Ligand binder design. Structure first.
Ligand SMILES: NC(=O)c1ccc[n+]([C@@H]2O[C@H](COP(=O)([O-])OP(=O)(O)OC[C@H]3O[C@@H](n4cnc5c(N)ncnc54)[C@H](OP(=O)(O)O)[C@@H]3O)[C@@H](O)[C@H]2O)c1
Ligand SMILES: NC(=O)c1ccc[n+]([C@@H]2O[C@H](COP(=O)([O-])OP(=O)(O)OC[C@H]3O[C@@H](n4cnc5c(N)ncnc54)[C@H](OP(=O)(O)O)[C@@H]3O)[C@@H](O)[C@H]2O)c1
Ligand SMILES: [Cl-]
Length: 175
């Protein structure tokens, strides 16, 4: 049909999402920035931008040929990027498989003509947007650790008053 704004990402188990939003509400007032909805919390692997249906099929076939074992993410880091005006969660030492997976999807995107910045992959989970002022960043909560078993292609849209990330396809990682 019509083109969509697409990105590949890793999702978070519902319980960890709940812990994150509780932690965020505890540590950041509304004025700190605009909260990412619980269901929209994710770790982007590759951003594709606007993509026709034909190109989406092509990239989906490429993603489907990726053979990457699963890995575990332990979110032990938080920070703020003032240039992007985001507050994020992350991993001090991401597993090699995460980097490998993101690098493959980014290369596939770039080869298809998708704008990739030459910027190095910086894995993160955005918690607050429009965080234009420096705020104290506490460490994340305890034991936000989980096994990643798959990755997903999402469509991004703004409908009503809300950002919506819609899952289109998923691919298991080898476990
Ligand atoms: O506050 P600050 O002065 O630390 O902000 P900042 O200077 O933009 O952030 C510093 C570090 O975070 C990375 N970074 C910043 N914004 C990013 C984004 N939107 N996506 C991915 N990586 C990002 C930068 O890598 P790059 O600037 O090399 O991407 C740089 O290594
Ligand atoms: N009033 C309005 O009309 C309005 C207002 C706001 C948003 N919107 C729309 O609603 C959606 C919200 O946008 P969004 O910012 O929530 O999501 P988005 O712009 O669709 O991006 C989705 C994900 O891709 C990442 N990303 C974007 N460019 C990238 C790049 N060059 N390299 C690596 N990663 C990249 C973002 O990273 P980060 O997580 O680091 O940002 C984000 O996690 C968009 O479709 C936007 O057009 C509309
Ligand atoms: Cl959101």
């Amino acid at each position: 049909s019509e083109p969509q704004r697409l990105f590949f990402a890793i999702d978070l188990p519902a319980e960890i999402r709940e812990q994150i939003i509780h932690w965020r509400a505890k540590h950041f007032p509304p004025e700190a920035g605009r909260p990412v909805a619980a269901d929209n919390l994710h770790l982007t692997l590759a951003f594709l931008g606007e993509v026709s249906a034909e190109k989406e099929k092509a990239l989906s076939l490429l993603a489907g040929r990726i053979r990457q074992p699963g890995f575990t993410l332990t979110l032990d880091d938080a920070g703020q990027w003032l240039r992007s005006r985001v507050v994020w969660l992350g991993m001090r030492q991401p597993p090699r498989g995460l980097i490998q997976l993101a690098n493959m999807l980014r290369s596939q995107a770039a080869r298809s003509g998708c704008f990739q910045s030459n910027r190095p992959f910086h894995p993160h989970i955005t918690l607050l947007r429009d965080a234009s002022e420096a705020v104290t960043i506490p460490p994340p909560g305890f034991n936000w650790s989980y096994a990643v078993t798959e990755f997903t292609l999402y469509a991004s849209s703004f409908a009503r008053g809300r950002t919506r990330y819609t899952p289109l396809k998923r691919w298991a990682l080898t476990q």
